[PDB]
């Protein structure tokens, strides 16, 4: 099992950048994929990316050349870089664990942060 | 002779990232020095980084390690990407431009934008990276 914490949130301009963490906690954190979801509010949670426990990644379409997933095992430490952020970014962002699964459904985790929000201005603003 | 504009800003938790851009109107961009300077409240507006025509940089000592300037010519664009962000990088950031400054001294430069906004979170909202 292991415990997840989310990190990094704030409201930005559109065309900016952010970087979540989600830092982990319990054993064999490197057996874990680890996905990153959204939930915007009256909205279903969704994929955003993966990350496999060798490194291969997967991205929504909605994110792709935009975000990039990332892992530092000795620090037991998953990122999203988020740049050129927009309007539909806007969420609450998860960090997803999981030993048996690295899909892009949310039923595949098992173990879940409790969340950071990320709001993006309207374009041109 | 350049007109600037600043974004990028926003309120980001301690420990977060942002990554203001600077983009430039005028002719010759890349003969052009950038500087950013930040002015946080009753705070003068002190220096941040600067990139020269060159590529050459220059950190302030508060930001070295956590802070990287660039520049894209070609998009007439320079950047400030800021990792583990602080209370003490609460400002209004700058970027300003100059063909003839290679020096700290805000009054070498003489081309300014409005300025961009950024607000970190206290320390203790920042968790205790690995
Ligand atoms: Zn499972
Ligand atoms: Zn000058």
């Given at each position: 099992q292991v415990q997840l914490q989310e990190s990094g949130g704030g409201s930005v301009q559109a065309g900016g950048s952010l970087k979540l963490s989600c830092a982990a906690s319990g054993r064999?954190?490197?057996?874990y994929a680890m996905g990153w979801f959204r939930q915007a509010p009256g909205q279903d949670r969704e994929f955003v990316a993966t990350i496999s426990w060798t490194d291969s990644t997967d991205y929504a379409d909605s994110v792709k050349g935009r975000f990039t997933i990332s892992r530092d095992n000795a620090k037991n430490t998953g990122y999203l870089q988020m740049n050129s952020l927009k309007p539909e970014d806007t969420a609450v962002y998860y960090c997803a664990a999981d030993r048996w699964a690295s899909s892009?459904?949310?039923?595949?985790?098992?173990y879940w942060g409790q969340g950071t929000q990320v709001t993006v201005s309207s374009h041109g603003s």
């Open positions: 064999s954190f490197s057996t892009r459904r949310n039923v595949d985790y098992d």
